[PDB]
Amino acid sequence: IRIRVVQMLGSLGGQINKNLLTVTSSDEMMKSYVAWDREKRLSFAVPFREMKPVIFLDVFLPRVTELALTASDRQTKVAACELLHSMVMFMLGKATQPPMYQLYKRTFPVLLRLACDVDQVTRQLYEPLVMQLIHWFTNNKKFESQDTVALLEAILDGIVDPVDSTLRDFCGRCIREFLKWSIKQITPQQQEKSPVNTKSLFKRLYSLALHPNAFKRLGASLAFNNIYREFREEESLVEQFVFEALVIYMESLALAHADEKSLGTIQQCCDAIDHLCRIIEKKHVSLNKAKKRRLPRGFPPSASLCLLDLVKWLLAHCGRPQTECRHKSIELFYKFVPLLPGNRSPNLWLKDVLKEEGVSFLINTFEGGGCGLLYLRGPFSLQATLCWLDLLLAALECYNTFIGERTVGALQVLGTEAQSSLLKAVAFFLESIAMSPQEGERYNYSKCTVVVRIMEFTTTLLNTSPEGWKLLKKDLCNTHLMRVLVQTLCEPASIGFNIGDVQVMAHLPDVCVNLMKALKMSPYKDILETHLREKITAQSIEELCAVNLYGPDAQVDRSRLAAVVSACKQLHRAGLLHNILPSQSTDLHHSVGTELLSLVYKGIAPGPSLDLSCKQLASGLLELAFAFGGLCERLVSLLLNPAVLSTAHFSHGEYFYSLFSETINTELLKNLDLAV
Amino acid sequence: EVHFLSLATNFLLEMTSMSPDYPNPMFEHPQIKHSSLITPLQAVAQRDPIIAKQLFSSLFSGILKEMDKFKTLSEKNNITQKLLQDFNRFLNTTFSFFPPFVSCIQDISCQHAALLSLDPAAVSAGCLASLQQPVGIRLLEEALLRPPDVLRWVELAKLYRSIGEYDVLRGIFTSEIGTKQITQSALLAEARSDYSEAAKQYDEALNKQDWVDGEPTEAEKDFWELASLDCYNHLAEWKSLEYCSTASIDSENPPDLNKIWSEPFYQETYLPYMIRSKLKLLLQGEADQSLLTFIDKAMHGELQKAILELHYSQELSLLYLLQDDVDRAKYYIQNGIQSFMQNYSSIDVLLHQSRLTKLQSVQALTEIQEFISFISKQGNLSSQVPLKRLLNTWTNRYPDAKMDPMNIWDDIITNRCFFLSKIEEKLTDISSLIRSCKFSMKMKMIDSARKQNNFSLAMKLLKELHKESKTRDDWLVSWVQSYCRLSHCRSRSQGCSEQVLTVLKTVSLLDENNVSSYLSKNILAFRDQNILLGTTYRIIANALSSEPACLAEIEEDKARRILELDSEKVIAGLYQRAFQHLSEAVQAAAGVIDAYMTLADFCDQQLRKEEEQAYPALVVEKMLKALKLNSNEARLKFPRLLQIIERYPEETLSLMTKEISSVPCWQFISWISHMVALLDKDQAVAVQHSVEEITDNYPQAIVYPFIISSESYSFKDTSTGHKNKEFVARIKSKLDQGGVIQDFINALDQLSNPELLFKDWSNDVRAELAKTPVNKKNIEKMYERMYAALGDPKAPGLGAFRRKFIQTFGKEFDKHFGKGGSKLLRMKLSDFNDITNMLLLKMNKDSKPPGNLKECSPWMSDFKVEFLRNELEIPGQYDGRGKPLPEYHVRIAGFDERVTVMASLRRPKRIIIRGHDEREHPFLVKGGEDLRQDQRVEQLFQVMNGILAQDSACSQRALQLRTYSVVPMTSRLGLIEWLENTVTLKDLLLNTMSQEEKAAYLSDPRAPPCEYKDWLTKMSGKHDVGAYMLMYKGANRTETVTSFRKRESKVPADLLKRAFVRMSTSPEAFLALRSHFASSHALICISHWILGIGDRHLNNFMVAMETGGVIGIDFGHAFGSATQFLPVPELMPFRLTRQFINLMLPMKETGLMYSIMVHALRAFRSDPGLLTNTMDVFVKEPSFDWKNFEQKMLKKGGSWIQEINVAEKNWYPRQKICYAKRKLAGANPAVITCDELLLGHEKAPAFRDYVAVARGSKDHNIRAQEPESGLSEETQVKCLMDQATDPNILGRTWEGWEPWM
């Protein structure tokens, strides 16, 4: 390896080669090549028989401290850990008879990195040491001095950092020990002054929490998941801070809008707020009063903040375009309405205030401040367009639960008597919805995440009160919505659905079919029939079902067949296939089904090789061919056949049974007593 | 010896078991037994060597400290002599060198009394081979503090010669091994890369005969031989190197054998040049046959084999490839790569330039490996395409120009041509591509060697290739073009006499063939030929126009050839020849930028000569058609256009509009505060379309330059100047649509301190109305700016917001602003501002400056960015130098909840804001300071260290001026970048003092403050300023000098040395902390003098405690203005005081703070004039007139109050460029201070004593014994360093400038 390093470094050039060493030479190395404290301490006096000279025990601290982390020999690693533990005990015993916090600030953030590293015996050591000196430092014999703040900032600088995921969950346990011993010892006749007290730690938590860094909110949520086991199981301390700061945890959750799904911050903040909403419904189901309460960030000031303004702030921020906050605020709205002293329900409440506070008042808190330009028909990702799309999605998913529940009606909220802007906004959206490459698909994903919500809204509006059909217009009953529906039915490689995902590709044929079933009961099934009766006809099938199928054509003809195969299978799940394609004026036996079965039977006759996707296509086609009618007697008659297929001559029926052998059997077992 | 330190501490610690103290020595509750620490301490020592070395080296000095109570005086001397003999025996007797043992004995030696005189020729031979040089260097220097005292300098030179560091090497060869007068004039002419005069005046000193004036000792009698060997080695002088290496040991015809193997001093410094030169001479084609037999006769034994295999081995691989046994060479080159890895792994990691000189040979090693592994396949030569791709990857891979010294270039070129000749034998178009590759690589070698000032190495390569360059036409024209470039460049250093004589000879050579039917078909080199001849006629016409008629006298044929092409009608004709040959090529990639810019600069300098034809029609088109392309040299010359168009308004204006409207609209963002200031100036229609274009595309980079240019723009009423105020209204109305940038600036205004703002307004009104109260309505036009910021608690609400400071100040001043509303709003008297001052002394004793939080300006404390409402985009990007990307500048995302005041007069504030890129950026805010001065001088520092990174001799040292950032958002409000972990120089030198040194320095009747003040009284009589006006005629020369030494000698000496030893605590790190401080301080002391900056007191130097390098801040007096306009002038060019000298002991000042200065000044005054142009178009800006300068000087309270009466007209922004151009083009730095003390202190009372002290004495100082003009760099910096420390000067200077420290 080293010879290869020098060979490549030689052939790498001459103007490139000296990039190697010349980074800075002073980044991390010139913090190890400097002193730790100016005036030395720790005079050790090795006792001989008569002399006793003095040895300064600092000059081999920054080499012991580097041996004890990456030694690569467990014969010197345990030696350095034993020497470092004895040296820590000596330097702790010296200062209790010489200020050395400039030594503490560099010898404390190595004890944690030792105490939770890998090895078990150096975990049996340094875990009770750093769990004991927390108990010593959090005592009144060394309270409020500058030495404890070094330990506390050592803990917090542990808890927020790149890559030390074995250490962050240890710093959580240190904060839990800190909180326990910081009320186990300090007495309330003197617990009113400390700037490292409980409430100072809480303000430190919130000032950590509203931070644009990715990690300084993950640190706050790990702190709260470790302190929710306390802060509820004792009294006379709970009703002040965090029962206001629930909104600041929710606002940090809102601030975590576009970090990453794979970071691990949303799963922590959701549990962080839920661990407290499971205690607001254990005491504030009973404890409700106008006591002296503390104001959080945002609300108007008063003398009490009991519950009723929290839900009003929620219902004023349920159209907030930060999605993971919007979901939690709607959910908390539903599980926070039935706790008024009237023991109410949503169905009384929202209409009960809509009758007496203005019809547009519950409109503008749905459309938001983004109700109010053909420069976007070129498919691109200008940051104004994406933010307007986010506003539209907020306006779209606000209604999707209030209409779907029995809280409000449908023609009550919408209609001609209000003159809102969403009904016009979706029609503005449905003009160029179907239309620097590195930012195009970024626009395409957020364009495609809203047509599914449009389809779900069109589904959920009808099937809750089917007497308000005609309040919608007819552009959605025209060649825009019934164009994009045929696009997401057959070939949605056009409107922007890229494949390479796994969520939306799996969620298309669960919403297309439920939308179609939400339209066959609708009176305008005829627009669907007259549109879809033009693309999947018999002549289009026989022009798709060609005469040359198994050759060098890889993508083209098998894809063009599989599109309409998937389309008709979605139709058969929908229960709308005889409302599209009827047979000839004959018996049951659908002529396209008999044609498909005869096609696959006579294809494998020679004039044949195979593949994997060719057999997948053949199995899908032969599975569709039984979905039309009864047809099983024809299938058994096909199976018992005495033909002879010669080859440079086996049976000509066992081959056709032997290839498929699963679709045939699961079709024969679909109907009993007329098969056997 | 690998285990001796562990065994020593084992035996030294075993006997404490028979000692009665193991009685739980912590003896309390939170203990540890005494056996629980001393047992693992010796258990860890026998595993790794470094902590064992530390244990032994501490316990030894502990024992010797404890021995000094008993064991009385007579015995300690014998014990220490025994230990000295033992350590001598150790160093002489050790066999396999161990680094943490050799360092251990040389560490415990250097901390005790008698052990210092160890073995001054065994220390060097041990440290040079164990690769532990820093500690021996420190040991020898500590022995040279507190003949044997000359050989010590020889071995210190031998140590410093191996780790680069050649400046400190030549700093002892002219001060200690000296006292003659050929070594000085040879080392001065080998300091610059001039390796022919210093290798021609060593033979003249080594073949001396008489010399009865003091015969030179045998310390330099061999040093002359060694240095002549080196200065023969650097340039390609092979045959005269073997002779001077072998012809001083034995007889004449070579007996070279065990002669050199015996007397091992003969083996060290005479072998490698010999084998190197013999191998190099064999590599070109001879028989030689003399080192082969010596190698084969030395290929026996252990001593004569285990050194020649251990050290070199690469010459052995080349030699056995020459004898053609390949696997022998393969074994030796594999040992060579293993040897290189073993060498590199032991150098301490911050010892730079040693690692570079080790890293610069792996290319040659892998080239030999590539050649063997190419030739070791039989079917590899079955075609020519492996050879073709081989030649392609060889040609693509060069060592770089300008950063690799020329022996490495010759190594790669010699090995490549030898490999090509061997392949040319082993494989037999094909025999033309080999020759073409050879010739092209040699031409790249010559073009690299011309750049870094190796001209003697250039000329021999020119003449060596010259016989080959006849077979074609393109090769000959490229050769004569390279010759013309060489003779163009090498004539810039020679004086005014020989300049015309050496550039005339590169004219007539070109009359031969590169014209015989070649300049009609090809057109590419057709332009370059005309460029070269035009520049040659430019040089000739520029030469004798400086000194007019004495120069065209001494020469017959030269004068006839000059007058062939009176006495003015030949100069005008030569200028005509230059202009015609420059207009040939423009009418005839990246080659058009040269052809444009030569004509551009020639016509510009001819116009600046002429101001004391159709040239403005040729300047603008030919410049802007290159500025349309990316051209950084043309990018800095835009205000030359904005001056030529103003002073030449008749023609070339619609031309200017038509050219400037068709351009990339992003190459003006650096010059935007000129173009937005030209709006109020007439003829602004040339700059409207580009400004509207940039405010359409990049609307953020024009905001803060527009606020100040719209803060004062009073138009005209003529017909061409009516639409301009509407255009200003158009840009103002289309900019700042969100109303948020104004809120940002308003919040930053609310952040600052108003208590000094009221003081600034008080001095403004008491300086405005106190001349004559006939000035119309100005107090009534300026009182609203006071009343908006201060007054009722509703005016800040209507301006920006409520303040926590206005709650205690605007609420307070309602009971004394009643007097304001009564009389101060309608004052018109200027008779009593003591009423303001008695309230002003109340406004500081009951006030609360510490606002303690961010909540003083709550717009930023609750930011919460939500949508597109003109997001802020943190102030300070858009540097220029290319197309911006306005999406990836870090948008602002939060303000941190902690402010910190600073320690100054004004106490500015610090903010800790966050970026959307998750980092935190700190910054510092300045309330009430104009900052278009510091922004301009940072632009000067950027152009200065853009110059500095192209001279090779400063690029190899890696000299850069470390800049910073300032943003002037509006007037009186700007952001300035704060740096992390830096300490002011005064704070370093004041913390490093011990507890009684500092306290008895501050509070003391004998202190150098109070002694200097009592000296001021006893020479003059009063106790104020004007005592300086009496002192210059109140004391003679030889009294102040002794009185200055007597109070200088009361400060401790080793204070910066103690500061760098307190924090380094590693002998390796101390070296590269001292050296970087010295290098950076040398560079800023020569860069503060070209543009003369004064007021260089203690707190305007900030050092960085992670690598020890100074930063210069607080740019008060920009051009020469500290000695013009202060009452008591200052006369020193920079600050080189006592401590900056006592850091460098025992070396004298000519070692490190001198060669940096010489190379930097040679880098500066060898330019086309970009620094002069940029200083000119800086000083020709109408924003810093006499009013703005006195308003700037009145910001602090101090020595400048009033009393000019002359300087309203004596500002003179042409004489400052005249004087800076003079002391850039060679001027005695006692004459510039003379003239600039005349021009401000003419008809002063004590003017004669000022001009006497600035002149010299002609007894002591070299600055009085030199011509006032026409000097050179080394003598210029010599009299400069003399004037920086002349104790007559420093005895009489300002008491806060701190001359005694």
PDB file of C-alpha atoms in Angstrom, chain B residues 327-401:
ATOM      1  CA  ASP B 327      17.823  -6.055 -11.849  1.00  0.00           C
ATOM      2  CA  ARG B 328      20.829  -4.673  -9.988  1.00  0.00           C
ATOM      3  CA  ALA B 329      19.352  -1.232 -10.690  1.00  0.00           C
ATOM      4  CA  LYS B 330      15.913  -2.561  -9.750  1.00  0.00           C
ATOM      5  CA  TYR B 331      17.188  -3.685  -6.349  1.00  0.00           C
ATOM      6  CA  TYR B 332      18.887  -0.347  -5.812  1.00  0.00           C
ATOM      7  CA  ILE B 333      15.842   1.732  -6.792  1.00  0.00           C
ATOM      8  CA  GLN B 334      13.584  -0.342  -4.514  1.00  0.00           C
ATOM      9  CA  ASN B 335      16.052   0.370  -1.732  1.00  0.00           C
ATOM     10  CA  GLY B 336      15.878   4.021  -2.789  1.00  0.00           C
ATOM     11  CA  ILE B 337      12.102   4.240  -2.395  1.00  0.00           C
ATOM     12  CA  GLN B 338      12.353   2.490   0.982  1.00  0.00           C
ATOM     13  CA  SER B 339      15.064   4.994   1.942  1.00  0.00           C
ATOM     14  CA  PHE B 340      12.886   7.956   0.935  1.00  0.00           C
ATOM     15  CA  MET B 341       9.993   6.730   3.076  1.00  0.00           C
ATOM     16  CA  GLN B 342      12.384   6.204   5.986  1.00  0.00           C
ATOM     17  CA  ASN B 343      13.726   9.747   5.570  1.00  0.00           C
ATOM     18  CA  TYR B 344      10.318  11.440   5.314  1.00  0.00           C
ATOM     19  CA  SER B 345       8.802   9.652   8.286  1.00  0.00           C
ATOM     20  CA  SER B 346      11.206  11.235  10.824  1.00  0.00           C
ATOM     21  CA  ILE B 347      11.063  14.971  10.063  1.00  0.00           C
ATOM     22  CA  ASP B 348       8.947  16.782  12.645  1.00  0.00           C
ATOM     23  CA  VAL B 349       5.680  17.718  11.060  1.00  0.00           C
ATOM     24  CA  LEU B 350       5.861  21.517  11.185  1.00  0.00           C
ATOM     25  CA  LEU B 351       9.425  21.689   9.839  1.00  0.00           C
ATOM     26  CA  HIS B 352       8.366  22.981   6.437  1.00  0.00           C
ATOM     27  CA  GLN B 353      10.702  23.577   3.441  1.00  0.00           C
ATOM     28  CA  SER B 354      12.744  20.575   4.525  1.00  0.00           C
ATOM     29  CA  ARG B 355       9.772  18.395   3.640  1.00  0.00           C
ATOM     30  CA  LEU B 356       9.397  20.336   0.398  1.00  0.00           C
ATOM     31  CA  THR B 357      13.045  19.751  -0.497  1.00  0.00           C
ATOM     32  CA  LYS B 358      12.486  16.073   0.265  1.00  0.00           C
ATOM     33  CA  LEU B 359       9.212  15.925  -1.664  1.00  0.00           C
ATOM     34  CA  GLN B 360      10.656  17.486  -4.783  1.00  0.00           C
ATOM     35  CA  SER B 361      12.454  14.257  -5.924  1.00  0.00           C
ATOM     36  CA  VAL B 362       9.743  11.586  -6.048  1.00  0.00           C
ATOM     37  CA  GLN B 363       8.994  12.610  -9.623  1.00  0.00           C
ATOM     38  CA  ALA B 364      12.536  11.674 -10.679  1.00  0.00           C
ATOM     39  CA  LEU B 365      12.435   8.412  -8.716  1.00  0.00           C
ATOM     40  CA  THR B 366       9.167   7.389 -10.324  1.00  0.00           C
ATOM     41  CA  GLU B 367      10.486   8.479 -13.733  1.00  0.00           C
ATOM     42  CA  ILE B 368      13.358   5.969 -13.405  1.00  0.00           C
ATOM     43  CA  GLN B 369      10.872   3.336 -12.203  1.00  0.00           C
ATOM     44  CA  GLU B 370       8.594   4.107 -15.153  1.00  0.00           C
ATOM     45  CA  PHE B 371      11.511   3.787 -17.580  1.00  0.00           C
ATOM     46  CA  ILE B 372      12.601   0.390 -16.235  1.00  0.00           C
ATOM     47  CA  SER B 373       9.037  -0.915 -16.127  1.00  0.00           C
ATOM     48  CA  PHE B 374       8.513   0.303 -19.689  1.00  0.00           C
ATOM     49  CA  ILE B 375      11.690  -1.289 -21.042  1.00  0.00           C
ATOM     50  CA  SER B 376      11.118  -4.621 -19.252  1.00  0.00           C
ATOM     51  CA  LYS B 377       8.603  -5.943 -21.805  1.00  0.00           C
ATOM     52  CA  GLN B 378       9.819  -7.451 -25.075  1.00  0.00           C
ATOM     53  CA  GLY B 379       6.520  -6.974 -26.892  1.00  0.00           C
ATOM     54  CA  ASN B 380       6.267  -3.385 -25.675  1.00  0.00           C
ATOM     55  CA  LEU B 381       8.542  -2.352 -28.549  1.00  0.00           C
ATOM     56  CA  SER B 382       6.495  -4.303 -31.126  1.00  0.00           C
ATOM     57  CA  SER B 383       4.863  -1.018 -32.217  1.00  0.00           C
ATOM     58  CA  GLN B 384       5.117   2.737 -31.664  1.00  0.00           C
ATOM     59  CA  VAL B 385       1.813   3.702 -29.993  1.00  0.00           C
ATOM     60  CA  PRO B 386       3.056   2.799 -26.451  1.00  0.00           C
ATOM     61  CA  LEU B 387       5.926   5.180 -27.147  1.00  0.00           C
ATOM     62  CA  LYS B 388       3.390   7.717 -28.468  1.00  0.00           C
ATOM     63  CA  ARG B 389       1.208   7.641 -25.357  1.00  0.00           C
ATOM     64  CA  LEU B 390       4.428   7.648 -23.309  1.00  0.00           C
ATOM     65  CA  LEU B 391       5.551  10.885 -24.951  1.00  0.00           C
ATOM     66  CA  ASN B 392       2.081  12.372 -24.421  1.00  0.00           C
ATOM     67  CA  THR B 393       2.011  11.648 -20.685  1.00  0.00           C
ATOM     68  CA  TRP B 394       5.618  12.833 -20.393  1.00  0.00           C
ATOM     69  CA  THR B 395       4.827  16.153 -22.065  1.00  0.00           C
ATOM     70  CA  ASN B 396       1.691  16.672 -19.974  1.00  0.00           C
ATOM     71  CA  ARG B 397       3.522  16.225 -16.649  1.00  0.00           C
ATOM     72  CA  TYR B 398       5.950  19.020 -15.756  1.00  0.00           C
ATOM     73  CA  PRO B 399       7.375  20.345 -12.551  1.00  0.00           C
ATOM     74  CA  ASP B 400       5.913  23.761 -12.245  1.00  0.00           C
ATOM     75  CA  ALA B 401       7.517  27.031 -13.157  1.00  0.00           C
TER      76      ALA B 401
END
